[PDB]
């Protein structure tokens, strides 16, 4: 197992992770090497395929020209996994498009063939023991898993000996339930991975730990004091949202309803959905209509980013914020969601001034809605600092970068390479 911790039966939460020793804020509970992992297509050339090191001058795989490495060692060590995609990418060419879930699942199957025994990533929970929620799957979810199974056979039949369709549905369901996205210091998606021992941790909306990444290594650090006998909880989702939104996401992706202190009390829901203090106060039904509109625009924008122009996308943000502002305060989470999306469009267009303009409005309400140590808060301070620094606003940049560092020292560890990079940014300018 893992020193100072143990697997146990958490009443109403299946299996969980329990502390057997105290942990203070910022302490590393444990580390978990990735069981299986895949670098996202859009990050190829930026990060090494094998170790996820972000560096310039990465060496290109000579055959496919679509995998990049630190050196010949990272190339060689990645070959058992890379071979699943190398020749297929050149052969299928433009037709090579498996989903990231399919790409990850092919790597799980390859790992099971090479290393059928328990790995150092499975000291407490094994990939084979993962919860699947197979019994909870409706026709729509089974059809999506069937599309994934067809893509797996379509792109990965060369090296893999597939189990029956039934075992593959269980696997795809286990991956959807237990898979992790690996994000960088700005919360930008790097890839997907399996961290079995990390997946043992149950969810809370008031977590006592944060998961961070050092290359492909998951690290688990306390963000609250943990005492012997206490269960170790991480957040599976974005904590900005009110109770109903959080539980709609938890039910849809994880098939459960949270009953943590935040979900039971609903204490933060009022400030999250802050209403304007108007002479004629807005009616209950008028609030409910705007909350419904707000959730609809969030979905509309999500679809629109796949095909609309940057000006059309900014229009959706501006127009929706205008409609919402008649009922909602600027600190309201639905207003903040659109501002964050608008900031993202500005960043893509390299409109640094516009991105800064939005980030300045988001920061104070973010700090209030998110927990004490939050990667979403750290990431926003970091973006702001980098924008300020890039725009020659050095004092404001330094202040915002130091706010990012203060949170990251707890979540990522004082010695994290990301913090050394941020300090170099403060020192170089």
């Amino acid at each position: 197992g893992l020193g100072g911790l143990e697997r146990f039966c958490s009443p109403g939460k299946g299996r969980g992770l329990r502390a057997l020793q105290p942990f203070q804020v910022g302490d590393l509970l444990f580390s978990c090497p990735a069981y299986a992992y895949v670098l996202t297509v859009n990050e190829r050339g930026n990060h090494c395929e094998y170790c996820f090191t972000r560096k310039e001058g990465l060496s290109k795989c000579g055959r496919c020209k679509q995998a990049f490495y630190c050196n010949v060692e990272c190339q060689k060590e990645d070959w058992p996994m890379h071979k699943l995609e190398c020749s297929p990418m050149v052969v299928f060419g433009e037709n090579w498009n498996p989903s990231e879930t399919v790409r990850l699942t092919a790597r799980i199957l390859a790992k099971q063939k090479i290393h059928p025994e328990r790995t150092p990533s499975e000291k407490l929970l094994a990939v084979k023991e993962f919860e699947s929620h197979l019994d909870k799957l409706d026709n729509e979810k089974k059809d999506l898993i069937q599309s994934d199974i067809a893509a797996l056979h379509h792109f990965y039949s060369k090296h893999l000996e597939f189990p029956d369709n039934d075992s593959l549905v269980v696997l795809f369901a286990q991956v959807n339930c237990n898979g992790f996205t690996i994000e960088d210091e700005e919360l930008s998606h790097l890839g997907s991975a399996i961290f079995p021992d990390v997946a043992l941790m149950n969810h809370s909306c008031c977590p006592n730990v944060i998961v961070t990444y050092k290359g492909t290594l998951a690290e688990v650090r306390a963000v609250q004091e943990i005492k012997p006998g206490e269960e170790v909880f991480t957040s599976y989702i974005d904590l900005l949202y009110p109770t109903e939104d959080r539980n709609d996401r938890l039910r849809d992706s994880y098939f459960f309803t949270c009953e943590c202190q935040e979900c039971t009390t609903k204490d933060k829901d009022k400030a999250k959905v802050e209403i304007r203090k108007l002479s004629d106060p807005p009616k209950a039904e008028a609030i409910r209509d705007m909350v419904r509109y707000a959730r609809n625009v969030i979905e509309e924008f999500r679809r629109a980013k796949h095909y609309k122009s940057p000006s059309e996308l900014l229009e959706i943000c501006e127009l929706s914020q205008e409609k919402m502002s008649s009922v909602f305060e600027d600190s309201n989470v639905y207003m903040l969601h659109m501002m964050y999306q608008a900031m993202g469009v500005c960043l893509y267009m390299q409109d640094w001034e516009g991105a800064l303009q939005y980030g300045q409005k988001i920061i104070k309400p973010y700090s209030k809605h998110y927990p004490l140590y939050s990667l979403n808060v750290a990431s926003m301070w970091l973006k702001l600092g980098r924008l300020y620094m890039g725009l020659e606003h050095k004092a404001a940049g330094e202040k915002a970068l130091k706010k990012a560092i203060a949170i990251m020292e707890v979540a990522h560890g004082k010695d994290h390479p990301y913090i050394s990079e941020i300090k170099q940014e403060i020192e170089s300018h």
């Binding site: 992790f180 994000e183 989702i237 990667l375």
Partner: peptide, 5 residues
């Protein structure tokens, strides 16, 4: 997948 953003 289990994330922040």
């Amino acid at each position: 997948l289990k994330s922040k953003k």
